Amino acid sequence: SKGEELFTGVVPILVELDGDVNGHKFSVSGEGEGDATYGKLTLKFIVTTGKLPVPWPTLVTTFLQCFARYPDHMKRHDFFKSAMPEGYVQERTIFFKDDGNYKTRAEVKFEGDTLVNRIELKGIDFKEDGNILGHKLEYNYNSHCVYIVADKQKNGIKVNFKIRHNIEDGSVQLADHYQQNTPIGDGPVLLPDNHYLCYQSALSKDPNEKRDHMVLLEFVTAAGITH
Numbered sequence: 001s002k003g004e005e006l007f008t009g010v011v012p013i014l015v016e017l018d019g020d021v022n023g024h025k026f027s028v029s030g031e032g033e034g035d036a037t038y039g040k041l042t043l044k045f046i047v048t049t050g051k052l053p054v055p056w057p058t059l060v061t062t063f064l065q066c067f068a069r070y071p072d073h074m075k076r077h078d079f080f081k082s083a084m085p086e087g088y089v090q091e092r093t094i095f096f097k098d099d100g101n102y103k104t105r106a107e108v109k110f111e112g113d114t115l116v117n118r119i120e121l122k123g124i125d126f127k128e129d130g131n132i133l134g135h136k137l138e139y140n141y142n143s144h145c146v147y148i149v150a151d152k153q154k155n156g157i158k159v160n161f162k163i164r165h166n167i168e169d170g171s172v173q174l175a176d177h178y179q180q181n182t183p184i185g186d187g188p189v190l191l192p193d194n195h196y197l198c199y200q201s202a203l204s205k206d207p208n209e210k211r212d213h214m215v216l217l218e219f220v221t222a223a224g225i226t227h
């Protein structure tokens with residue numbers, strides 16, 4: 001169908017990422033499903049081979065805002081689903097405080113009945129003994145809300161937010177995200193009034209999986225607009 005109708009049930013998800021951080025090349029494949037009625041995503045990511053060169057938590061935001069639960073009074077503000085099936089391009093620059101940065105470009109769109117998130121990531125200037133390349137981040141994830149704003153001239157949305165990654169020493173590693181989303185096709189899209197998307201995420205492991213991997217459970221709920 002078109003738009004939100006594509007998300008009324010459980011939708012299989014495929015995620016693919018090709019990455020390069022400080023020359024260290026790697027790829028990751030993920031699969032799972034999203035149930036936007038509950039704003040719920042369940043995914044498992046497996047590195048193609050060997051060990052992932054960066055901490056899994058640092059890739060959570062890069063690895064599906066179309067699965068957010070927009071309340072019944074906010075359906076006209078859901079840009080993400082409105083772009084489906086053709087989809088949108090999501091671009092980000094993520095600056096890790098006192099360390100390197102990731103630049104990502106992803107195409108989120110349906111291929112058949114599967115929602116696919118295909119990503120290219122390039123990371124540069126990371127410190128060999130920093131929290132990222134040094135794998136000093138805790139395997140967990142904090143909750144928070146981000147501020148969504150329309151970008152009328154780009155016919156999309158913009159988002160700037162920070163992720164606080166807990167460090168084993170008790171401190172926190174900040175990752176400043178600058179995000180832009182643009183539709184792929186020339187069809188209509190819903191440009192929203194400013195609002196919030198609130199996330200709750202839990203990282204875990206598959207008990208029997210021997211490969212380097214991450215299981216992610218995420219709930220995303222839109223808020224901020226008056227009834």
Ligand SMILES: [Cl-]
Pocket residue numbers: 198199200221
């Ligand atoms: Cl929430």
